[PDB]
Amino acid sequence: GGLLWKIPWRMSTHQKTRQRERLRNVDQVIKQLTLGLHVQRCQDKGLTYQEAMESKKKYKPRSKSLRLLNKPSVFPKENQMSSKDKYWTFDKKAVGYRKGIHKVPKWTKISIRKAPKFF
Amino acid sequence: VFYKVTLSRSLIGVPHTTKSIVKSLGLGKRGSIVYKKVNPAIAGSLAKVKELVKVEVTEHELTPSQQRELRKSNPGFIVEKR
RNA sequence: AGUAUGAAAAUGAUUAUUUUAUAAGCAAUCAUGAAUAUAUUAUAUUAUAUUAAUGAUGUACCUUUUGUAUAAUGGGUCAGCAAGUAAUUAAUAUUAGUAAAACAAUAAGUUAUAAAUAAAUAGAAUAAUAUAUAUAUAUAAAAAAAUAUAUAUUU
RNA sequence: UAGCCUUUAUAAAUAAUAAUUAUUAUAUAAUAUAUUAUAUAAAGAAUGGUACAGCAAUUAAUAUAUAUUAGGGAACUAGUUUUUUAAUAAUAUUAAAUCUCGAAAUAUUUAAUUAUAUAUAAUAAAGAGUCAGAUUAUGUGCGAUAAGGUAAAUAAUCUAAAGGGAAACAGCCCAGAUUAAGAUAUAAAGUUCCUAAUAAAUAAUAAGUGAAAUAAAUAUUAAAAU
RNA sequence: AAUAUUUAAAAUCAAAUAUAUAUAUAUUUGUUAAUAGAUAAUAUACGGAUCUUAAUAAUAAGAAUUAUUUAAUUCCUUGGAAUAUUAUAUUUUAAAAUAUAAAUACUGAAUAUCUAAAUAUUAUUAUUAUAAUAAUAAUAAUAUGGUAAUAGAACAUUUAAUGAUAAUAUAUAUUAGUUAUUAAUUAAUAUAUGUAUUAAUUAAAUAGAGAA
RNA sequence: GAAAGAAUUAAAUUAAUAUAAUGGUAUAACUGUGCGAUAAUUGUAACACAAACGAGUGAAACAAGUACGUAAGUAUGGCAUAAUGAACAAAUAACACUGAUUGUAAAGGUUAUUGAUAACGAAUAAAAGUUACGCUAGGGAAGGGUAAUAUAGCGAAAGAGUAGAUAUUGUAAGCUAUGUUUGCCACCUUCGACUCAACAUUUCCUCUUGGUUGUAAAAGCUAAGAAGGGUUUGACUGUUCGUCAAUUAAAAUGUUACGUGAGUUGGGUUAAAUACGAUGUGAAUCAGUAUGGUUCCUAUCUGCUGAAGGAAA
Ligand SMILES: [Mg+2]
Ligand SMILES: [Mg+2]
Ligand SMILES: [Mg+2]
Ligand SMILES: [Mg+2]
Ligand SMILES: [Mg+2]
Ligand SMILES: [Mg+2]
Ligand SMILES: [Mg+2]
Ligand SMILES: [Mg+2]
Ligand SMILES: [Mg+2]
Ligand SMILES: [Mg+2]
Ligand SMILES: [Mg+2]
Ligand SMILES: [Mg+2]
Ligand SMILES: [Mg+2]
Ligand SMILES: [Mg+2]
Ligand SMILES: [Mg+2]
Ligand SMILES: [Mg+2]
Ligand SMILES: [Mg+2]
Ligand SMILES: [Mg+2]
Ligand SMILES: [Mg+2]
Ligand SMILES: [Mg+2]
Ligand SMILES: [Mg+2]
Ligand SMILES: [Mg+2]
Ligand SMILES: [Mg+2]
Ligand SMILES: [Mg+2]
Ligand SMILES: [Mg+2]
Ligand SMILES: [Mg+2]
Ligand SMILES: [Mg+2]
Ligand SMILES: [Mg+2]
Ligand SMILES: [Mg+2]
Ligand SMILES: [Mg+2]
Ligand SMILES: [Mg+2]
Ligand SMILES: [Mg+2]
Ligand SMILES: [Mg+2]
Ligand SMILES: [Mg+2]
Ligand SMILES: [Mg+2]
Ligand SMILES: [Mg+2]
Ligand SMILES: [Mg+2]
Ligand SMILES: [Mg+2]
Ligand SMILES: [Mg+2]
Ligand SMILES: [Mg+2]
Ligand SMILES: [Mg+2]
Ligand SMILES: [Mg+2]
Ligand SMILES: [Mg+2]
Ligand SMILES: [Mg+2]
Ligand SMILES: [Mg+2]
Ligand SMILES: [Mg+2]
Ligand SMILES: [Mg+2]
Ligand SMILES: [Mg+2]
Ligand SMILES: [Mg+2]
């Protein structure tokens, strides 16, 4: 290994904060998507925008992917997530079966919340 | 109701399927704002690119001209010709 | 190796301005003091020009390579010279001329005007769009594959 | 030659790209134990056999004061018991590139709908170049679970991409330079000084451990929980 | 206290979210540290300085390491409210009371916006003179890194065809201006020439050299 | 209640399939049996799959004829996926198409068939070696990485040690370091001697110290600190190495382009000459042996050794 890819094995505090913020943003996006759908469905039934926003009973999304994203068991929120799953991917060939998320290529775009139950 | 979607991240490190989805959605460059009438189809498409994009719901959409007008900064002066 | 002329450059010496004897690397660019020069509108607290205070950024150029600051190629510098051109043809395209004809006008020829078929004495609505017709295979004649021909004016 | 690139055009043109709907079940309401609507749940039309999971059949491995089949010993007067040797059965437990009876996600992929049209496909007439590739990540073959190794699979970047970060850096993290301007949002990465930018909270460390390239079995000393 | 394990949130408990809801069901989260082991040849090598805090005593420092977090702290549902803080002003006796503010952490690209300029296309205009056009100028949008390659548009140079003009001119050179500038033009200065095969349009090329 | 039939359910594709392996097959594609021996036929084949082209694959339908079946229908070889070869040039037939003045002919064409190019998209009907006498065009189409090996260490301790695993020893298996050996990779196209050495410490000697029923003493053995100083001369060989001789306090191990050829040498390795043994028909060749035998360099910069001038004191 003569070429030096000087990437540290762990993240800095600032990196971790940025990661957390990014995670929070994707959750927010999902929430917005569900909310807009609900609003649209209220409008279709025949309420005003404000009335729809007020509504006690929020409509859950019917499409599959959205419904999965909504579930925390499948796609957890940043507040829900463990410290470890925010900053460590599962890597079967690593010692500890764990690897920094920053070592994943395009980790800033690519999402990866859920690790295996005991790894 | 309308999703105001914004292409927050670039499409440089992004695979080709996700690029194609972004193109279909209508977003060109980074930070280029697009309003979309809400429906299941557009919602699913947005979910597919959830990490590149910032979405927020709105009462009304805005045409490109309106958006431009909103953007324009205040010229702090009033011309008086003589 | 003509004759004039020659502030063309490389190159040498000298003078002037400016910087330089505690500072380290493509010697430039950008920031920025100072010094000097010029300026018949510097009215100035001015403008331009020249100059390695000081600060920041800055890994020659080409070639060949997956990849070159490379200790890979090539160049001492400047001046001059040094590389997709012609002929005879064919196919496309664009325009222009003429146009069911064109070129040529002496005739002759080339292309077009009919599609086929290895080739032969075969060759396009019997009452209309293919469901008709022509050709090649086949045949008594159709059907069948293929391509072509037809819905005031021929293309 | 095809693949990928370019130019000029053609339409009774959207055929392209992306997603949704499509299914199953439950509850509620309305009609005729069925149908429709609404809401919710379910990795949700069709195709599949990798991961995972599993030991079924196949191929392999282990154990039985268990049973049967024979054999070798052994005690009394050929019969009999025990300590057994293998095989077979029974029961329990295990694994495999060429085992999958269970089984994902990603994937392949169809209709209509919506969204992309200052956008795509297809076709027609013409021009190319290229066929030494590299690294990173993931899943493998070879190698020794060695190589800046080698061989291909998928994605990205470099190739041909300047800019910010990673001390310096082809391939990593961001992000694509038409020309400026420099007020505002920022990305990745940073905020004691060098060096543009910082203040807090709660724990732990005392080894300069560490502070952007994490060195192992094991040992000692503590600390919690039982 | 002693012996022996484990270093765990599966179970268990605690806390939080979602469905009927003072409870039940389902989901999500929470379970050690230090040292030794430790190791080669130009020179210490976190990039370097340097970083672990301390009462008296500061209008003042107290990780710049590791782990979990925040953008002053606490409740309620990004937002408001309360709480103290900090700074400031006023009033009263260096303190107290009142009120105003700050709470949007910041840096950061050739990213995006704004601000202007250019070209190209699409869609609207305006002005001036296939007028369904051309030129120029507006507005909105999209696009403009590029090797191999493809396509489009220009300029310099030399010759041929046509061709005014003139030493107050032309050409070449130097210096300083000008025009979004390989080019040309203005002025000054110099040297030549009684003068552009000149401007412009065509036709062509021994038509552009830091790379053999 | 009994007999017979029709059968259904469960299981099975582990047998069998002309033939490998895979998929399929009991609704059988497997097996038996009647007829038959035909469809192991003739012209057009769309449309798909696959696909650079050349080819390859499935195939509806139309037309002619055939075999089986009461009929429905089925058959354009085999349950499927291998069982193969272009043109050119010859050859054989059929076709009635051309017939170089006309007629015949020849010769060519169409249709069907034939043999191989296995380096198997086949260059020709037909082609092996050698060069250290070689030549031209190009390409690189010890250092670096690795650490299997090697060297060193650690953990655990079977076992030796008169008794006791751990004074000293330490099987096989375990965890590391090193980049000193032999390899592997292919980014990257000279051994020894002399001379002068610089550095490391994993210490051979000298200094300090722990352990040593195996430290009585003296010699040792083993371990910790320690790089200040020191660490060989000869015979043999080109050798480093090694064997030995004589010494020494000791004759340590490396790194430095296995330091040092613009500093020396040139014995080894190395081309031209020649011979020997072996190999080859031979030219010639060799992880062979032997004699002979070719590079040079005035120092520009860095650096180092000395010596001046200038200077800001
Ligand atoms: Mg000085
Ligand atoms: Mg110097
Ligand atoms: Mg050099
Ligand atoms: Mg060079
Ligand atoms: Mg040279
Ligand atoms: Mg016939
Ligand atoms: Mg090609
Ligand atoms: Mg469609
Ligand atoms: Mg497999
Ligand atoms: Mg199965
Ligand atoms: Mg290749
Ligand atoms: Mg490689
Ligand atoms: Mg290249
Ligand atoms: Mg770059
Ligand atoms: Mg690119
Ligand atoms: Mg761009
Ligand atoms: Mg340290
Ligand atoms: Mg380090
Ligand atoms: Mg739990
Ligand atoms: Mg060091
Ligand atoms: Mg640092
Ligand atoms: Mg920009
Ligand atoms: Mg461009
Ligand atoms: Mg020339
Ligand atoms: Mg020249
Ligand atoms: Mg040039
Ligand atoms: Mg068979
Ligand atoms: Mg079988
Ligand atoms: Mg296909
Ligand atoms: Mg084909
Ligand atoms: Mg059969
Ligand atoms: Mg031949
Ligand atoms: Mg004749
Ligand atoms: Mg061949
Ligand atoms: Mg071949
Ligand atoms: Mg060949
Ligand atoms: Mg041959
Ligand atoms: Mg010889
Ligand atoms: Mg090495
Ligand atoms: Mg013993
Ligand atoms: Mg051993
Ligand atoms: Mg003694
Ligand atoms: Mg030592
Ligand atoms: Mg001393
Ligand atoms: Mg001697
Ligand atoms: Mg050497
Ligand atoms: Mg030398
Ligand atoms: Mg040298
Ligand atoms: Mg002699």
Structural method: cryo-EM
DSSP H helical ranges for chain A = 13-45, 49-54, 64-70, 83-87
How far apart, in whole angstroms, are the C-alpha atoms of residue A48 and residue A42? 8
Q: Specify whether the CB–CB gap between A81 and B33 falls below 8 A.
A: no
Chain F bases under 7 Å from protein CB?
A: 144-146
The resolution, in Å, is 3.2
CA distance A24 to chain B (A): 11
| Polymer length in residues for chain B | 82
From edge to edge, which strands make up the β-sheet containing B2-7?
B33-37, B2-7, B53-58
Beta carbons within 8 Å of B49's beta carbon, 6+ residues apart: B18, B21, B22, B25
How far apart, in whole angstroms, are the C-alpha atoms of residue A27 and residue A32? 9
CA distance B30 to chain A (A): 14
Any idea which residue has 């194609």 for tokens? B20
Residue of A nearest to B50 (CA): A26
Closest by Cα among B28, B25, B31 to B45 = B25
How far apart, in whole angstroms, are the C-alpha atoms of residue B78 and residue B82? 13
Beta carbons within 8 Å of B38's beta carbon, 6+ residues apart: A36, A37, A39, A40, B1, B2, B3, B57
Closest by Cα among A27, A51, A28 to A41 = A51
CA B68 – C1' F113 distance (Å)? 83
Structure tokens at A49: 């925008």
